């Protein structure tokens, strides 16, 4: 007959292999077929990718079906169906946007997501897969958990970042604070990150040398707390460059207080 | 616990089949019974043997038994159950006999096995035979029927009726399991046969907690043994037996029953005293 | 203590069934009564033998009794109950035998059950079989008829009627359970039955302090056991028993009961001399 | 286990085949039964020796005896089948016997094997010969009929039958084996009944891990042995035998039985207010 891949109640099991604030990963293995991920990754955004990756690649682009059908021990209810996809070619399958959430709802619902496509493997006959429900809700429960512990930041929002001092004072603002507490979380959770680039500078008000040694003792402060982080100290760089090289109209109160800044930009290995 | 160790599968039933029938190569422990030689003339003569009209067999090797053998649920011709023989006359002993053909009957009068074989006595008047009945006939099953299964709960109670419907609803979905009262759980199942038992063995498997129950005092008048289950609570009070008194489980009433010499059955008599004054928080079942 | 612990969901009832039948395979202890061998005869035509009138059957192995069994609620068919065999007749011992096929009534005359299996028995003339009774037919129920479910208290106070009403109140909400006796507290409960077994097994797990109840002093006149209940308060007053003098719970009485050499149950006397000068603080019931 | 272990094919099955014959050879151990010189007389004229009637034959070595044997499926004409032989009339031995020609006869009526041979004899009374009958007749069979064969396990369970069809499925591909209840898997098979022979050689040597099964509580009352199987849970209780008090498998059970004298089968009444009290997650089973 037809092929149809779904794992049996015996056999159908989700695992939640990525638990981290920066990244959530749902895994369903379809038996014989390969394995069915639901990925949220630390964003502004509401963002899930679904992944439908098979051991035996796309042979070729093909229109997908998909379904919402109800399993076998729910007799009297009709199949919904959902889209159309497109499968393509050495890719894996990919379902995002309202359509992954709404897999996900059909799955809590206690339904079966069904992909049908003729597969070029097969002689170019159809076949189905299916991801359970069986053994869901508690591992859904879970994935909800990660997601609401996500970074609502991503590394595009945090990579370059600009901080404020106080007029008297070695301190950074509140607000400057509290960026660089955002930056030590992302840091602090990500480990992917090589490069910290300090660049410390000051107002005009002090001398030359009182710049350049207000400007050192402050990138010297921030790589000693980016060495708490848990960084080596071959990859945090730190240089002051005193009142040299003004962004702003230096003698206006605010433009020295934007000149008494220090940059910070991160830089990591995906 | 497994759902299949604390319940059952409504519609798949066992079925109990009787027979009458005749022991035979008995050590000389048989009987002379009017029916046994009654019906060991009537098998003769099935055989070709026919003795004059009130001829004395004089038998001593043969008795008359009931047999009694349970039918399994889904049990097909050609499948062999357990029999047990037991004997309604006045033989001393089965001990080494032989059952002969004998016919179990049904509920309904008809021949559902036949029973032979060897009985294995460890009372020497009763003994089994491991294979001694084959069946010969099927008995109709409404388990493929319907779009639900229900599970019968061993153990009646609300709340263990409540933890196996939400155990299956967890593993499988919403809205898959309902109790409909304290003893039944109905959960929905596929129209195919086959997929049905695949369905009912992975449903069967799973794991929940039993509720404990009402608490309850069941006393053994005949045996003397008391069991208290858990959640009986034993109000305080000053309990006088003989000539001693004890003030307030079961372990301070002991020692005031070793106190005196009395007995050990006499602690019946003290709870009853007990909750005739309301000092028990449970029930007191007497077997 | 739990509301299952403590009390009974009205509507949800036990019934009792009751038959005869006979006890095959004792080793040569069974009777020869009249009825007993009346009944054998009956069971062997039922199965083709049949005895000349006027036929002795000089058994020996096979005892008349009495089959009861107690049908738990929401029994439903295919279900196993326990059954008590008790001997009628004047069998010596039931031990080692076997029930044949017996069925049992109910109060309105209706078979609801068939019992048979093996009497485990210690009294031997009585003995037990743990799934001896097969449930055959259904009792119908009140428990998802109405708009309110009912609890009936196992010792009946209006205080612990009160307090069940409001531990479910302060659970669930105002206006919602009610007491309308010292026995009865009404719930207001869902109208489909799958909630309504989700709703009671929520409820019936509601921990609350019953009351302590009236002050009573219960006394077994024929074990001699005095169980004095809490907030029983004896009077002050002389007690003159055989030679001495007492001043005065029953451990300055059971002094004066050791004094003179008199008895233990001499103390059950002295109680009712103390209730007709009035100095008891309570009931002296006499069981 | 492989499935020729567990399971036995659909319509491959047994008959039992009975008889009537004597037994010679006896060392003045045999009958004086009426209907065993009747026969004896019969015997003889079968051979051209016919007494006068009312003659005794006071014979000594000779005994009437009930001949019976299981014919195995695919029995052809020219085999021999073990027989056992009883004595049904008053003989004290068979020891040392001959067994004369016999008849077996089938459930129909018709002779399917001749039994003779020497009886072998530990019970004196009950012998057996290794090839007495010869098969003379055929059986038909539907094994080689049909689009499939059916497996029936010797343990019924809904477990087993999927995961003995998960077997032949992995074995062999998918959509060949399906359980259509807890006792049986269907196997498509091949029309062609030597391709079918050896399609079931393949199959039947196939290993699957049959399902624990229900937990159950297996007592013989009048042995005393109690079989505890797996997945049996005992809740706590507090239980009072005797005179000592124990809280709680069965190795508790026993200490608590073996603290006072009582007796080792005085358990099997502790399991039975256990039950009574709930405190027994499984079922308990008397045989």
Known sequence: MGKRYVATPQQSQWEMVVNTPLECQLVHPIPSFGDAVFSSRANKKINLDFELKMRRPMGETRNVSLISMPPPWRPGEHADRITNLKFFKQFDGYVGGQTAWGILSELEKGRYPTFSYQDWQSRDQRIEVALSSVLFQNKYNAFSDCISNLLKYSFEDIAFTILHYERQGDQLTKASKKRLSQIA??????????????????????????????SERRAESLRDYFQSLGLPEDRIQVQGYGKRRPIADNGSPIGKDKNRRVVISLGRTQ | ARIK??????????????????????????????????????????????????????????????????????????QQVDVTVSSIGSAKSLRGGTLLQTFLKGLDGQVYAVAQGNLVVSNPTVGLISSGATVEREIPNPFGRGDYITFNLLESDFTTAQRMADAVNNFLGPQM????????????????????????????????????????????????????????????????????????????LVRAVNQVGAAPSDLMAILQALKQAGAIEGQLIII
Do not use: C, W
Not at chain 2, 182 to 189: E, F, I, L
């Open chain 1, 185 to 214: 979380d992302y840091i602090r959770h990500n480990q992917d990150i090589d490069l910290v680039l300090v660049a410390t500078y000051t107002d005009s008000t002090d001398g030359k040398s009182a710049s350049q040694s207000l």
């Open chain 2, 5 to 78: 160790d604390v319940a059952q599968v409504a519609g798949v039933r066992s079925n109990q089949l009787v027979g009458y029938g005749l022991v035979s190569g008995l050590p000389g422990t048989g009987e002379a019974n009017p029916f046994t030689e009654q019906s060991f003339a009537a098998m003769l003569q099935n055989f070709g043997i026919q003795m004059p009209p009130g001829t004395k067999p004089k038998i001593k090797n043969v008795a008359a038994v009931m047999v009694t053998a349970e039918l399994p649920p889904f049990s097909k011709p050609g």
């Open chain 2, 177 to 252: 399991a309902s109790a409909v009262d304290a003893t039944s759980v109905r959960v929905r199942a596929p129209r195919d046969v086959s997929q049905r038992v695949a369905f009912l063995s992975a449903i069967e498997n799973l794991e929940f907690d039993p509720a404990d129950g009402a608490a309850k005092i069941i006393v053994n008048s005949r045996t003397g043994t008391i069991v208290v289950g858990k959640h009986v609570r034993l109000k305080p009070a000053a309990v006088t037996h003989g000539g001693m008194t004890v003030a307030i489980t079961l372990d301070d």
